[PDB]
């Protein structure tokens, strides 16, 4: 069975975005408590990540973007307002105390895991704090400030000829996509809602550019996709991707906001279907790195990222055991969710159309 390395620092659950803000890092702490009381923590290699410094954050970002982040505080908020507009810090990307330290942890957890897989001393690595995929080279976006995913990926390319990135998140992974848009070495696939939705990106025709053309797959969607639909479109695709791209290391972003009953998300998936993806990628047996990301009904984010960990460990788990946050989990106190009566606007014709378009794009690649 596969070896798993888990990364966690406790201050992550204590950093606070602000009033009414859907991003709440406390969810990661809940997961950490449930993995434990499930008895799984026992089974895997646990780590604290040390702080990631501006040295290695700047290996992708601007030297002054990071300098701005290192310098900014709510104290000097009105002083820096000129730059704040230049760097997108505002309405939905607030300033809050301990912001930079939160980044150093989320980034340090990923980059540490990037080396561990590069070192060939694990098979899987997980950092649920990571998975922030909207951040840009020179500006924050979509609650993301530093794109650890890139910074992780940039390490793996040292060792790995072809790195596959995948994105389940209901939001499109434009940050990682943009950050590898013209390189063939990094394939960015993204399944996501599209149409009247953030970041507005990742349509059918977002293919790539230059060398990176035909290496940025996308798959827009409408409301209310089921597990059955999603499975029937996920596995065939990824099979062809593995058939064509032939990566030597995977990075799966396990966006949980694509679940049913999300605050911001409007998909209709369960833990089982969301996790069945993680099973399928695990089946291919590459060096692996599972991250988190979006997810805003935190009671189910906990259920999601917990269960998905068990899948990386290929063990069974029932009945939610007792823990600190046991009272969060509704009257049911159950792991699994069921889909809603919400309507699936993804007709079979619309799915089969786009499918065939993609197959054509994937056939363009070299093979024998």
């Amino acid at each position: 069975r596969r070896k798993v390395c888990y990364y966690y620092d406790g201050d992550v659950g204590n950093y606070y975005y602000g009033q009414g803000h859907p991003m709440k890092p406390h969810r990661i702490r809940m997961t950490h408590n449930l993995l434990l009381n499930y008895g799984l923590y026992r089974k895997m290699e646990i780590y604290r990540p040390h702080k990631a410094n501006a040295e290695e954050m700047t290996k992708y970002h601007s030297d002054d973007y990071i300098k701005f982040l290192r310098s900014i505080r709510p104290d000097n908020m009105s002083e820096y307002s000129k730059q704040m507009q230049r760097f997108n810090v505002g309405e939905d990307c607030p300033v809050f105390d301990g912001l930079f330290e939160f980044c150093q942890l989320s980034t340090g957890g990923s980059v540490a895991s990037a080396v561990k897989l590069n070192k060939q001393q694990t098979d899987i690595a997980v950092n649920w704090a990571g998975g922030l995929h909207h951040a840009k080279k020179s500006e924050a976006s979509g609650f993301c400030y530093v794109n650890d995913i890139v910074l992780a990926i940039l390490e793996l390319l040292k060792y790995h000829q072809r790195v596959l990135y995948i994105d389940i998140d209901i939001h499109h992974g434009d940050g990682v996509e943009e950050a590898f848009y013209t390189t063939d070495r990094v394939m960015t696939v993204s399944f996501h809602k599209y149409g009247e939705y953030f970041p507005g990106t990742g349509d059918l025709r977002d293919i790539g550019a230059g060398k990176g053309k035909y290496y940025a797959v996308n798959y827009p969607l409408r409301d209310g996709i089921d597990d059955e639909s999603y499975e029937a479109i996920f596995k065939p695709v990824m099979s062809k991707v593995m058939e064509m791209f032939q990566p030597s290391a995977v990075v799966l972003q396990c966006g949980s906001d694509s679940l049913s009953g999300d605050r911001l998300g409007c998909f209709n998936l369960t833990i089982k279907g969301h996790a069945k993806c993680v099973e399928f990628v695990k089946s291919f047996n590459l060096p692996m790195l599972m991250l988190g990301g979006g997810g805003y009904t935190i009671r189910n984010v906990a259920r999601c990222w917990t269960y998905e960990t068990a899948v990386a460990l290929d063990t069974e788990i029932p009945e939610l055991p007792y823990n600190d946050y046991f009272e969060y989990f509704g009257p049911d106190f159950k792991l699994h969710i069921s889909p809603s009566n919400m309507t699936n606007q993804n007709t079979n014709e619309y799915l089969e159309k786009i499918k065939q378009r993609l197959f054509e794009n994937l056939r363009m690649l070299p093979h024998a």
């Binding site: 604290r48 992708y60 980059v111 540490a112 080396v115 080279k137 943009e178 950050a179 390189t183």
Partner: protein
């Protein structure tokens, strides 16, 4: 629909495509804080002993912050596989002394009735400051102030 500016594109992954075991750190980036151990601990004789060890703790044993399970969770980890070395360094002088090099310990672990009353009124006036209430209690931080706000929010039900 967005644009792809050449200046703000990305920073050239810069690989060698092999770099095989190239003396990388990450003993620095991360610190090991558990190893799987089923040799003498889970050999179908002792795997149930830890289950009893841990439910044991959330009871009249010493506190560190006050949830007496977590201290015992912390300490079996602290001992790397052992029972009495656990039980001793658990009970022996203090839980802070034997392990200070990780510092996650103090992070994870990290309120009087007087401050409690002022907090309740301090929150019943602003209800969303978290900067002036911090100045109300300079001793305590926004983290603990926010933590107690949740524990109360849970005690509502």
């Amino acid at each position: 629909e967005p644009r792809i500016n050449v200046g703000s594109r990305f920073q050239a992954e810069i690989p060698l495509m092999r770099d095989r075991a190239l003396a990388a750190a990450d003993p620095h980036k991360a610190d090991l804080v558990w190893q799987p151990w089923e040799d003498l601990e889970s050999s179908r004789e002792k795997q149930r002993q830890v289950e009893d060890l841990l439910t044991a703790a959330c009871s009249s044993i010493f506190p560190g912050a006050g949830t007496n399970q977590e201290l015992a969770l912390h300490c079996l980890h602290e001992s790397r596989g052992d029972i009495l070395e656990t039980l001793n360094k658990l009970l022996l002088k203090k839980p802070l002394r034997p392990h200070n090099h990780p510092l996650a310990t103090y992070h994870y672990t990290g309120w009087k009735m007087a401050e409690r009353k002022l907090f309740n009124k301090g929150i019943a006036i602003y209800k969303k400051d978290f900067f002036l209430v911090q100045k109300l209690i300079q001793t305590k931080t926004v983290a603990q102030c926010v933590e107690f706000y949740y524990t109360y929010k849970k005690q509502v039900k």
